[PDB]
Design a binder for these strands. Sequence first.
DNA 1: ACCGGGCCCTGCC
DNA 2: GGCAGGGCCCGGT
Lengths: 272, 272
Amino acid sequence: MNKQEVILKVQECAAWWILERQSKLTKLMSETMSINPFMTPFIFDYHSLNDFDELVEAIIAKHLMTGHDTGFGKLIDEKILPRVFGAYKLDKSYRAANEPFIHPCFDEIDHVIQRDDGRIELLSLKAGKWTIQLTMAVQLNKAFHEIINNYPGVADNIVVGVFYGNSHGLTDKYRILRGINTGANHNVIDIRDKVHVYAGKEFWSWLNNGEAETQHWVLEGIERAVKEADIKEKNKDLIEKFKEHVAKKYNEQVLNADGTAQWHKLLEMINE
Amino acid sequence: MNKQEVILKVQECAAWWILERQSKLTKLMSETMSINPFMTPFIFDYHSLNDFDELVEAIIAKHLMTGHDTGFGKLIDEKILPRVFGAYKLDKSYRAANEPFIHPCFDEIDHVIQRDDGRIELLSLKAGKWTIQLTMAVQLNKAFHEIINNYPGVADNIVVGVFYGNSHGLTDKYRILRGINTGANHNVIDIRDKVHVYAGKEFWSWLNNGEAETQHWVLEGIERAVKEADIKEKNKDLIEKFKEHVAKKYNEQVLNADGTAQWHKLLEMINE
DNA sequence: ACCGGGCCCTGCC
DNA sequence: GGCAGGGCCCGGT
Ligand code: NA
Ligand code: NA
């Protein structure tokens, strides 16, 4: 894909995603927000919060940020890769229709990449160096080893993509998933010849047939969509109203007369 | 364990932990803080930030909150359960000293609980409804199945503890780990006779031999520890200085004269 | 309400 | 610097 193809189509995807994240606020969707009732007194003082409204504000901001990271990884995987780069996403419909992708060892594979020279690459994509931990890495090894040994014909190789950061900053989990296990034993199997990891600039390059500048074209598409969306003023009030909607869930039952929180009442509500 | 034992010993653990989270700030420990360089323009406008320093303040606040959740989970598991409730932590030394615990299927078991009536229960502990996703649930299933099949004599049963929330609020992942798989096939094995999940008030009560008020004693220890640490004033400056520290890692490469940032320089730095 | 995924660190070696 | 773990949602349906 060339510079115009990438910028314009990323813009389109990102434009959509901005609306989706706005709708979180306009529709007052707070049902997915967890609160750890043991940590509340700690957070209140560590971050120098002055009242219950300020507590709800800090919690909401954290929830929104978590949501942004999650939605963004979904955006890259489910919209940008297929629509901008022509990757075939292994969604429900694709998997049911294309043998042998229905088997659960493909739950860990995001896309099939069909190269112009006839090569087929399978892709398992992650955002960054922290995205996986040990449990996930071992499970990735199990899945990949099954593909390799039981469905050798489906593709020429498996790539794990990491869309930001670099190779040197990756954790040992990216070794574990290849079967490289230098510390305590976890019973992963060496598959390093068939599974390769590409990160950051090098991932975007690998995706787009060696075009080194691809990552800048992606960032530019996002920039343009943000600018056209023009949300920097209107969101202040939408965020404040999200905050008021959440506090109303608690502020006529956890508060004392002096405005302090009854942390044991918040505990009660959450833990049963 | 009785009311005063739990309150006071939780207080000692939490006081230790407070000092750990303080030393994050005083030692300017920021090398674990990732930044997604594609999201920066979105965050900047969505949350109505005015310059690079406000972007760094926002990201640090999020990283601190992530670090709090992470730390607190490790606190419950590694310090509180063993020091307060007498649970045996499967750390490296314990696992080496007690067959068959060195085997990797026990990688997912946090503790052995020895009941005074002779019962022996294994515990895999999690914070909340969101802690695990599909990949982790399926791996947990595999580890627990192997324990049940290959090591039936090591315990009476396995418990998954969820330390906040309630059973109604749990996701389907807590069913999947038991081998209950009603949707797309993931090849998990039904082990629900030997694996049970307890959440919130019920987890704490299960842990402490049926004492229903245990969750409240845990919270009271934490509150005392926070009250006693007196951190609300001094942290304001500590967090400001953490921000100054982080911003200097990028300022020379990314800053415009007006204190805004060059997103493409930020991307270049991060992605190779 | 389901559900198949998506995502970011600490504390001690 | 390694490493065995620790943590929290979206979007389609
Ligand atoms: Na993925
Ligand atoms: Na655990």
